[PDB]
């Protein structure tokens, strides 16, 4: 739901207000534990509704799944227990930014560095870090490798000193070769 | 007569007159008469006192100079810190060695027509391998060098 600020109102949810009611009940139980049936009966709830509340209270981390013996409440009885890196570069006078940027990538070596981590380490803007990487690619001093991590197909950059020996090269080259085999042994 | 087109040279010739007229208007022959050098403020350091300031390379890299249209000399030159090769007898270029990588340099100005001896002031960093972060003050020891080039008449 999108509300323009003038019209912003905190819309509740049926499960939320019932979870709060169950929390009020359980927190006022001296043990903070009650059986599901009583927790339903205290609110007249059907099991179909209540099992959402139970699992939402669990998923919210507000309560824990527990079972107590009937002689412990006074048979095992199901219950709810309520509970509630790269160092930056000191840019030097005597070297151009491409020399200084290649030195950073050399100090990374086999593990490489992304454009975003170059950007922070060099203390430059997004467009400026981008141009540095494009030039270092075309000068053939740095080799770029893709790495999927999280949601992002980030590029990582490695100097041609370490590029061939790098993990990203070795991993990619194996899966490339394996792919070219599998596709060529697939029938024409 | 130098072989460039006249329309390429014409701004060059024009700039001579414009510079001379500017200097006649807006340079001067004397200023800061209060600040004449006093010899008692110029203390000569002894050899063992000077040694911390001297730039650290004692001999230049080996080099050779090829000049277009001359025969190949083929010798490698090398020269001591604070020493110079002789000017080429026909083309008058000179190389000299300052003991470290040069990071400032200016000509001593002389009033036009003085025909004086010409000098340059320069700074060459102590160590070839040093490189200094801009974000931090340094305050180390160093040396300012004055080199005399002669009067440079033909």
* Separation CA A127–CA B53 (nearest Å): 43
* Separation CA A147–CA A172 (nearest Å): 10
Q: Do A93 and B134 touch (CB under 8 A)?
A: yes
The CA distance from A109 to the nearest CA of chain B, in Å, is 21
Q: Do A92 and B125 touch (CB under 8 A)?
A: no
* H or E segment and range at residue B122: strand B118-124
Residue A142's alpha-carbon distances to A94, A148, A149, A152, A165, in angstroms, are 22, 19, 21, 21, 13
Give chain B positions within 8 Å (CB) of A95. 131
* Separation CA B56–CA B129 (nearest Å): 11
Burial class (CB in 10 A: 0-12, 13-18, 19+), B13: exposed
Mutation target for A interface from B133, B137, B140, B142: give the one with most A CBs within 10 A.
B133
B100 and B127 Cβ atoms separated by less than 8 Å = yes
Q: Do B134 and A94 touch (CB under 8 A)?
A: no
Give chain B positions within 8 Å (CB) of A92. 131-134
Put simply, the chain B residues between 20 and 59 with a CB less than 8 A from any chain A CB are none
Sequence-ordered list of residues with C-beta below 8 angstroms from that of A87, at least 6 positions apart, any chain: A121
Nearest alpha carbon to residue A146 among A178, A187, A175, A125: A175
Is B39 in a helix, a strand, or coil?
Answer: helix
Give DSSP secondary structure letters for A111-166: G-EEHHHHHHHHT--HHHHHHHHHHHHHTTSEEEEEEEETTEEEEEEEETTTTTTS
Give chain B positions within 8 Å (CB) of A90. 133-136
Tally C-beta pairs within 8 A across A and B.
22
Q: Do B132 and A94 touch (CB under 8 A)?
A: yes
Q: Do A94 and B136 touch (CB under 8 A)?
A: no
Measured in degrees and rounded to the nearest 5, phi and psi for residue B140 equal: -70, 175
* Separation CA A77–CA A91 (nearest Å): 68
Give chain A positions within 8 Å (CB) of B131. 92-95
Nearest to B135 among A90, A94, A95 (CB): A90
Give DSSP secondary structure letters for A11-68: ---HHHHHHHHHHHHHHHSTTSEEEHHHHHHTTT--HHHHHHHHHHHHHTTSEEEEEE
Q: Do B103 and A94 touch (CB under 8 A)?
A: yes
Give chain A positions within 8 Å (CB) of B132. 92-94
The CA distance from B35 to the nearest CA of chain A, in Å, is 33
Experimental method: cryo-EM
| Residue of chain A nearest B103, judged by CA positions | A94
Give chain A positions within 8 Å (CB) of B133. 90-92
Measured in degrees and rounded to the nearest 5, phi and psi for residue A52 equal: -65, -50
Give chain A positions within 8 Å (CB) of B101. 94
B66 and B72 Cβ atoms separated by less than 8 Å = yes
- The CB-based long-range contact list for B1-9 (8 Å cut-off, 24+ gap) reads none
* H or E segment and range at residue B50: helix B47-50
């Amino acid at each position: 739901l999108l509300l323009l600020n003038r019209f912003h109102v905190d819309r509740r949810s049926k499960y939320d207000i019932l979870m709060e009611k169950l929390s009020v009940m359980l927190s006022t139980r001296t043990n903070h534990i009650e059986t599901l049936g009583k927790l339903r009966e205290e609110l007249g709830l059907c099991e179909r509704t209540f099992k959402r509340l139970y699992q939402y209270m669990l998923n919210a981390g507000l309560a824990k799944v527990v079972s107590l013996r009937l002689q412990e409440i006074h048979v095992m009885v199901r219950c709810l227990k309520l509970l509630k890196t790269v160092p930056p570069v000191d840019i030097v006078f005597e070297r151009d930014m491409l020399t200084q940027t290649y030195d950073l990538i050399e100090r990374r070596g086999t593990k490489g560095i992304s454009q975003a981590e170059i950007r922070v380490a060099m203390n430059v803007g997004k467009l400026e870090a981008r141009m540095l990487c494009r030039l270092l690619q075309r000068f053939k001093v740095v080799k770029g490798f893709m790495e999927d991590e999280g949601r992002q197909r980030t590029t990582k950059y490695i100097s041609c000193v370490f590029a061939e020996e790098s993990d990203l090269s070795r991993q990619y080259q194996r899966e490339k070769a394996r792919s070219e085999l599998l596709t060529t042994v697939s029938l024409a | 007569p130098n072989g460039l087109p006249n329309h390429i040279m014409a701004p060059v010739w024009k700039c001579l007159h414009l510079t001379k007229d500017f200097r006649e208007q807006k340079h001067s022959y004397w200023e800061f008469a209060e600040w004449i050098p006093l010899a008692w403020k110029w203390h000569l350091l002894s050899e063992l006192e000077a040694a911390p300031y001297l730039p650290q390379e004692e001999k230049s890299p080996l080099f050779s100079v090829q000049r277009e249209g001359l025969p190949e000399d083929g010798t490698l030159y090398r020269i001591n810190r604070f020493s110079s090769i002789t000017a080429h007898p026909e083309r008058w270029d000179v190389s000299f060695f300052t003991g470290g990588p040069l990071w400032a340099l200016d000509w001593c100005p002389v009033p036009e027509g003085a025909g004086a001896s010409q000098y340059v002031a320069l700074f060459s960093s102590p160590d070839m391998n040093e490189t200094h972060p801009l974000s931090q003050l340094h305050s180390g020891p160093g040396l300012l060098q004055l080199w005399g080039l002669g009067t440079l008449q033909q």
